Amino acid sequence: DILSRLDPPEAEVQIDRLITGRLQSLQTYVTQQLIRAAEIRASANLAAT
Amino acid sequence: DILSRLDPPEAEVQIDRLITGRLQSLQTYVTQQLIRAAEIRASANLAAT
């Protein structure tokens, strides 16, 4: 709908905002999965011992 | 190249787009190093034991 109702020069501006938000969300997700996996690893290490 | 084919009022807008990206990339580098150092630290703590 963003494009469907506009030219390229005018749509690229909005699509870059959408891209910025959606990339920020994915970085937040991946950083928290990295922090949460190091906590699961310390627990599996205790289980092995 | 932005300081050679743009006047100062137009080169600010183009320099800020680079500043934002490079800051993002540097800060991603610094987060992943904290997460990797916290893992090297536990290995060295096991080696000391």
CSV table of C-alpha atoms in Angstrom, one decimal:
chain,number,residue,atom,x,y,z
A,1,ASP,CA,0.0,0.0,0.0
A,2,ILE,CA,2.9,2.3,0.6
A,3,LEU,CA,4.1,2.1,-3.0
A,4,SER,CA,0.7,1.3,-4.6
A,5,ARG,CA,-0.2,4.9,-3.7
A,6,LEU,CA,2.9,6.8,-4.9
A,7,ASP,CA,6.0,7.2,-7.1
A,8,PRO,CA,9.4,5.8,-6.4
A,9,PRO,CA,11.1,9.0,-5.2
A,10,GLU,CA,8.3,9.4,-2.7
A,11,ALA,CA,8.1,5.8,-1.7
A,12,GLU,CA,11.8,5.1,-1.1
A,13,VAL,CA,11.6,7.6,1.8
A,14,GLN,CA,8.9,5.6,3.6
A,15,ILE,CA,10.4,2.2,2.8
A,16,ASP,CA,13.7,3.3,4.4
A,17,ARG,CA,11.8,4.1,7.7
A,18,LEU,CA,10.1,0.7,7.6
A,19,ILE,CA,13.5,-1.0,7.0
A,20,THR,CA,15.2,0.9,9.8
A,21,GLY,CA,12.5,-0.2,12.3
A,22,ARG,CA,12.4,-3.8,11.2
A,23,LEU,CA,16.1,-4.1,11.3
A,24,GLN,CA,16.2,-2.7,14.9
A,25,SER,CA,13.6,-5.3,16.0
A,26,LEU,CA,15.7,-8.1,14.6
A,27,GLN,CA,18.8,-6.9,16.3
A,28,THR,CA,17.0,-6.7,19.6
A,29,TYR,CA,15.8,-10.2,19.1
A,30,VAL,CA,19.2,-11.7,18.3
A,31,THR,CA,21.1,-9.9,21.1
A,32,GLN,CA,18.6,-11.3,23.6
A,33,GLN,CA,18.9,-14.8,22.2
A,34,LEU,CA,22.6,-14.5,22.6
A,35,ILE,CA,22.3,-13.5,26.2
A,36,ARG,CA,19.7,-16.2,26.9
A,37,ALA,CA,21.8,-19.0,25.4
A,38,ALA,CA,24.8,-18.2,27.6
A,39,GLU,CA,22.5,-18.8,30.6
A,40,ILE,CA,21.4,-22.2,29.2
A,41,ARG,CA,25.0,-23.2,28.6
A,42,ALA,CA,26.0,-22.5,32.2
A,43,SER,CA,23.1,-24.7,33.3
A,44,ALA,CA,24.0,-27.6,30.9
A,45,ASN,CA,27.6,-27.3,32.3
A,46,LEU,CA,26.3,-27.8,35.8
A,47,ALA,CA,24.2,-30.7,34.6
A,48,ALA,CA,27.3,-32.4,33.0
A,49,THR,CA,29.2,-32.0,36.3
B,1,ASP,CA,32.9,13.0,-2.4
B,2,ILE,CA,30.0,14.4,-0.5
B,3,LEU,CA,32.2,17.4,0.4
B,4,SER,CA,33.0,17.9,-3.3
B,5,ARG,CA,29.7,17.7,-5.2
B,6,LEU,CA,27.3,19.1,-2.6
B,7,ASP,CA,27.0,22.5,-0.9
B,8,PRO,CA,27.2,22.5,2.9
B,9,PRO,CA,23.4,22.6,3.4
B,10,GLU,CA,23.0,19.5,1.3
B,11,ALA,CA,26.0,17.6,2.5
B,12,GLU,CA,24.8,17.6,6.2
B,13,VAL,CA,21.9,15.4,5.2
B,14,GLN,CA,24.2,12.9,3.4
B,15,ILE,CA,26.8,12.9,6.1
B,16,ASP,CA,24.3,12.1,8.8
B,17,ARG,CA,23.2,9.0,6.9
B,18,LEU,CA,26.7,7.7,7.1
B,19,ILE,CA,27.2,8.7,10.7
B,20,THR,CA,24.1,6.8,11.8
B,21,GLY,CA,25.2,3.6,9.9
B,22,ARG,CA,28.8,3.7,11.2
B,23,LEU,CA,27.7,4.3,14.7
B,24,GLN,CA,25.3,1.3,14.5
B,25,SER,CA,28.1,-0.9,13.2
B,26,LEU,CA,30.6,0.1,15.8
B,27,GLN,CA,28.1,-0.4,18.6
B,28,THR,CA,27.2,-3.9,17.3
B,29,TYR,CA,30.9,-4.7,17.3
B,30,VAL,CA,31.1,-3.6,20.9
B,31,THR,CA,28.1,-5.6,22.1
B,32,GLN,CA,29.3,-8.9,20.5
B,33,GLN,CA,32.7,-8.5,22.1
B,34,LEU,CA,31.2,-8.1,25.6
B,35,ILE,CA,29.2,-11.3,25.0
B,36,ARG,CA,32.3,-13.2,23.7
B,37,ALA,CA,34.5,-11.9,26.6
B,38,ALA,CA,32.0,-13.2,29.2
B,39,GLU,CA,32.4,-16.6,27.7
B,40,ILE,CA,36.3,-16.5,27.6
B,41,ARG,CA,36.1,-15.4,31.3
B,42,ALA,CA,34.3,-18.6,32.4
B,43,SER,CA,36.8,-20.8,30.5
B,44,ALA,CA,39.7,-19.0,32.3
B,45,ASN,CA,37.8,-19.4,35.6
B,46,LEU,CA,37.6,-23.2,35.0
B,47,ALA,CA,41.3,-23.3,34.0
B,48,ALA,CA,42.2,-21.6,37.2
B,49,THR,CA,40.3,-24.2,39.2
